Design a protein around this ligand. Sequence first.
Ligand SMILES: [Mg+2]
Ligand SMILES: [Mg+2]
Ligand SMILES: [Mg+2]
Ligand SMILES: [Mg+2]
Ligand SMILES: [Mg+2]
Ligand SMILES: [Mg+2]
Ligand SMILES: [Mg+2]
Ligand SMILES: [Mg+2]
Ligand SMILES: [Mg+2]
Ligand SMILES: [Mg+2]
Ligand SMILES: [Mg+2]
Ligand SMILES: [Mg+2]
Ligand SMILES: [Mg+2]
Ligand SMILES: [Mg+2]
Ligand SMILES: [Mg+2]
Ligand SMILES: [Mg+2]
Ligand SMILES: [Mg+2]
Ligand SMILES: [Mg+2]
Ligand SMILES: [Mg+2]
Ligand SMILES: [Mg+2]
Ligand SMILES: [Mg+2]
Ligand SMILES: [Mg+2]
Ligand SMILES: [Mg+2]
Ligand SMILES: [Mg+2]
Ligand SMILES: [Mg+2]
Ligand SMILES: [Mg+2]
Ligand SMILES: [Mg+2]
Ligand SMILES: [Mg+2]
Ligand SMILES: [Zn+2]
Lengths: 69, 91, 50, 62, 101
Amino acid sequence: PRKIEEIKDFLLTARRKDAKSVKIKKNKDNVKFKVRCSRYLYTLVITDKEKAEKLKQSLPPGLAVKELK
Amino acid sequence: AKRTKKVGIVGKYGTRYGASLRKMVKKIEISQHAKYTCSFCGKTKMKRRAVGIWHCGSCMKTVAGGAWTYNTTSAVTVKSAIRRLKELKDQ
Amino acid sequence: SSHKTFRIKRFLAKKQKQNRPIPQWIRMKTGNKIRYNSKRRHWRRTKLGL
Amino acid sequence: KNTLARRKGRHMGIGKRKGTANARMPEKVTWMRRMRILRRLLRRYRESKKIDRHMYHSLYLK
Amino acid sequence: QVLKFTLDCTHPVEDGIMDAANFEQFLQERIKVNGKAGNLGGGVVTIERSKSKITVTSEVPFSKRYLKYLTKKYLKKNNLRDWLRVVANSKESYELRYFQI
RNA sequence: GGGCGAAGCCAGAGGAAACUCUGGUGGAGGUCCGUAGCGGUCCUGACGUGCAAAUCGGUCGUCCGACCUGGGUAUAGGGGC
RNA sequence: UCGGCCGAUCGAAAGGGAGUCGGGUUCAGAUCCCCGAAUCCGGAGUGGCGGAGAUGGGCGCCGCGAGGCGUCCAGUGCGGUAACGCGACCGAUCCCGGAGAAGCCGGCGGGAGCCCCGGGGAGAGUUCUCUUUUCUUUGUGAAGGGCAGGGCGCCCUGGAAUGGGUUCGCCCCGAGAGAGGGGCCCGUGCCUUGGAAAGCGUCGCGGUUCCGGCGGCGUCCGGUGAGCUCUCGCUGGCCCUUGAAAAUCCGGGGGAGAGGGUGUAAAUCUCGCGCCGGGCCGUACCCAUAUCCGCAGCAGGUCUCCAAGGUGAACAGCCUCUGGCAUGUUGGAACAAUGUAGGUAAGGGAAGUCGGCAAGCCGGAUCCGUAACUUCGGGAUAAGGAUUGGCUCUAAGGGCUGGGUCGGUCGCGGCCGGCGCCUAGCAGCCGACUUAGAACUGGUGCGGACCAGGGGAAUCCGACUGUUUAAUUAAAACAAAGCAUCGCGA
Ligand SMILES: [Mg+2]
Ligand SMILES: [Mg+2]
Ligand SMILES: [Mg+2]
Ligand SMILES: [Mg+2]
Ligand SMILES: [Mg+2]
Ligand SMILES: [Mg+2]
Ligand SMILES: [Mg+2]
Ligand SMILES: [Mg+2]
Ligand SMILES: [Mg+2]
Ligand SMILES: [Mg+2]
Ligand SMILES: [Mg+2]
Ligand SMILES: [Mg+2]
Ligand SMILES: [Mg+2]
Ligand SMILES: [Mg+2]
Ligand SMILES: [Mg+2]
Ligand SMILES: [Mg+2]
Ligand SMILES: [Mg+2]
Ligand SMILES: [Mg+2]
Ligand SMILES: [Mg+2]
Ligand SMILES: [Mg+2]
Ligand SMILES: [Mg+2]
Ligand SMILES: [Mg+2]
Ligand SMILES: [Mg+2]
Ligand SMILES: [Mg+2]
Ligand SMILES: [Mg+2]
Ligand SMILES: [Mg+2]
Ligand SMILES: [Mg+2]
Ligand SMILES: [Mg+2]
Ligand SMILES: [Zn+2]
């Protein structure tokens, strides 16, 4: 697994051709966006919730947006 | 305190092998395990590695020497003789 | 053992297959003269050749 | 319960000892603790300027 | 710094096999504060009842499992141990109910 | 798992020196007591149509070494070892 | 033109040898199946995408400046004094080196797992009285990133005797100590992605005759150590003993060559990502007082890994927990002789017997105290003597922090300073075991079971340790070091 640090790197990671799906896991303290690429599972950790909600609608279309809750 | 009167290093052999054989091996074992002053670096670190092989820990210089002493009295006279014959050979 | 060669495993496979009772309809054949499989082998009584 | 008694000193005695004094509390371990405690004290005294290099080195050998 | 644990005696009191008044009357002398039973350790640990709910509020480090230990001690004294059972229904709360056949 | 405590080293004391004495440290050895292991002393014990075509009980020897042991190799009959 | 594996080939399921882990699942298989996270090797000719190479200066001009045009010249990366670092970082034949690749033993130190202690939960046990009690349980794989921690015979400054640093031991230093500042390696520890969604513990609700069902809550905080077991490291000792090889992989030296004419460029790339593939054979189970060998479900034999609590020196013996079992190919009833195994015995104490055979005595630890003889090492636990319980205390043996003389002031707080003498060192907190001494006390009993040397005086033989007739002889026999002799210059 790989941990994506800032928001921008996650966007073009999710826009890759080998990105199979993105999973959103809502914990008590953070929201994790996990995109399943060919080699690695890229996880982006968002501390707050407004940025997590903003990222939810900005995801590329045609990609599975499975919610883990 | 001085722990033994006369056996010294061969106290490890106990009562075994005979007094004269222990006395004979005593002076060899002392020179075998002694640390000599290295003639290359000047440090007292030249110690026996194997039989006939003497190695210095500091300059990592390995010398071929005697079995129990760093050099034998045989080889020392030989080196002096070879030097004398070499300076006689040339002029 | 658990580690075995293919030739040994094939040998043991044949021994399993031929260690079975005769079929019941054999005894009804004309002039049978066979009562039971006399070449039955038990793993504990007699050991295999290898 | 018996461990708490042994802390206070019960069941130690002379008739409760089966091993040698060195097997119960090794002298080499006792010497290490003493050397480590005393060398640490001498070091802390040297870096707190209670003693100098030369008094430290005399006491270290002592 | 307030603990506020709770004991719920509802199923047995509605079946009349025990009363919460006596169980309250049992706790105040058995609770030990700093090892001393009686006087609730100088009244630091308080006790009160809602006729089914007995809540214990403390201002000192006080264990919830102590209430279960004390409650089980009451039930054995009153021969209720073979029918009732103290179960943690939530945090800061205990509740005693029947064995389910 | 314990015992003994070789050389090397530190401190103190006595000495003109040579050196000596005391207390520690150190941890050597085909070293000691003794497990596991390996072996097999005595009971001339048990058994002796046995549990066993050589086993069992207690007692024993050794247990850092010429130590114990698996597997792989080599040596074959007037030959091997 | 270059090209010696100078020799086929075979030889290890314990040596060498890249790279898979966590959860679930069966009646029986799983590191192989399913789920999820990785990873190694190989391939990509028509070149898969990026990134690197690699895209800057000079001069004429235009242009208010900035910036645009032409020409010329570079450009096989860059940083640090250094150790060395950064994401790549052209390069053949050839050469050099490394890794693979190294014994046994000792002593320390780091890390983990387990054990122990103090609390917080959840569930159980006891409750005749006591017991805030006793018991169970209380996760985070590989692979990445970061940080501890450990190690360095690595670098720079500097130059040390009144020598100093330093270990349990050692050991180190003008061939460069101490001190200050750096660099590298390992990082199995912690945090993080994996990750809680899983797993587990509890409490419930539905049913799909047999749900990876649904749901609530929890999965917490600390402290210890000559502890045990693995592992990593450091430093020693021993050897007339010096403790594999080869596949395989890598680095360096050298520079034959290749690449482009200033282009949105070339050769090239051990950098990031992407695409495809990994065939063959083994895999169940037993592994032993019943799956093997011994004619057998035979008290024999048969190579290893893991390893809890108490007592205790202890992997001893004895009791217990997890796990396992049914007493070893039968039961019942009696309790004769004789037996086998185990005890006790008044008085005497080897009178028994070939012979103290067998049994018994002694035994641990502490404090004393120890002879002849001797190869000076030993003898030696010589011999001999005293003590040993329980309970209540008293001393002694450690580690962490903080020691200010104060508003002269504002980042009831902070930068400098007039502002003071712990300097015979204090104050608080935490913490193991161990030793010594004392009182009291029991029907003198206390290493209370277990564990656990009888001793001395001599003679013979063999020096010792070692070995030996598997199945009647373990010896004084053999061996041994030491001594001596003999043959031999290929
Ligand atoms: Mg058989
Ligand atoms: Mg020995
Ligand atoms: Mg012995
Ligand atoms: Mg015999
Ligand atoms: Mg007999
Ligand atoms: Mg081969
Ligand atoms: Mg299985
Ligand atoms: Mg984790
Ligand atoms: Mg230095
Ligand atoms: Mg959960
Ligand atoms: Mg299997
Ligand atoms: Mg058997
Ligand atoms: Mg046979
Ligand atoms: Mg049987
Ligand atoms: Mg029986
Ligand atoms: Mg039976
Ligand atoms: Mg008698
Ligand atoms: Mg008598
Ligand atoms: Mg007689
Ligand atoms: Mg007679
Ligand atoms: Mg006897
Ligand atoms: Mg004697
Ligand atoms: Mg007493
Ligand atoms: Mg002999
Ligand atoms: Mg002799
Ligand atoms: Mg033999
Ligand atoms: Mg025999
Ligand atoms: Mg002689
Ligand atoms: Zn030298």
